């Protein structure tokens, strides 16, 4: 699996996951799978970065924590928005509105509803992405054309074909499940 990783992933991906699970004291050679879901979740969050006019999406994942609080502080004092309580993924200048961006293995709705709970914020907009192409959005704004978010999906089943392929898929969609129970 970690082999895997490093080819199907850009350096910079698998370099800023790599951080992501220090930070935590996590192990990417023992916890292989949640290096695989960090990865995949970053890449989702650069391509929907990109899906925009350039300068519409601000950053917030991906980097050292203390900065992207820095940034979202920046953000809430300058445009009057809430400061949200859990760390989002995305700011839309376009939308005035952060964005969490989730990628399950599991149920759309299911994960939609574990978010929304927990962030328990009325601005924050949520997107939620699975591997077999559904997608739920806050309101139904899914915020990007229908081109940008089939590229998203595409490339989702491709990581699933790829994995099944080697026959880390089951062992993959198993550690998601295990981790919520
Ligand atoms: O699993 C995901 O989709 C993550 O986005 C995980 C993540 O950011 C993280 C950060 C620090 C430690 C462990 C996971
Ligand atoms: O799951 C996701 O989509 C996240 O975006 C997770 C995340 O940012 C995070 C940050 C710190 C600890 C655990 C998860
Ligand atoms: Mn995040
Ligand atoms: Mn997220």
Redesign the pocket.
């Known amino acids: 699996m970690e082999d895997f990783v490093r080819q199907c992933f850009n350096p910079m991906i698998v370099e800023l996951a790599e951080k992501?699970?220090k930070?935590?004291g996590?192990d990417p050679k023992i916890e292989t799978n949640?290096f695989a879901?960090?990865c995949t979740?970053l890449e989702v969050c650069f391509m929907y970065s990109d899906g925009g006019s350039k300068h519409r999406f601000e950053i917030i994942e991906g980097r050292d924590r203390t900065m992207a609080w820095t940034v979202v502080n920046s953000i809430c004092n300058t445009t009057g928005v809430e400061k949200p309580k859990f760390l989002p993924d995305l700011y839309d200048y376009k939308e005035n509105r952060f964005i969490e961006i989730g990628?399950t293995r599991r149920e759309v709705h299911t994960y939609y509803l574990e978010k929304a709970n927990k962030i328990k914020s009325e601005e924050t907009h949520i997107h939620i992405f699975s591997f077999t192409g559904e997608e739920m959005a806050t309101k139904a704004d899914y915020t990007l054309d229908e081109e940008s978010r089939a590229r998203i999906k595409t490339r989702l089943f491709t990581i699933r074909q790829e994995m099944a392929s080697r026959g880390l898929w089951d062992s993959f969609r198993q550690s998601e499940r295990a981790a919520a129970e």
């Open positions: 992501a699970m930070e935590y996590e949640k879901a960090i979740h990628v």
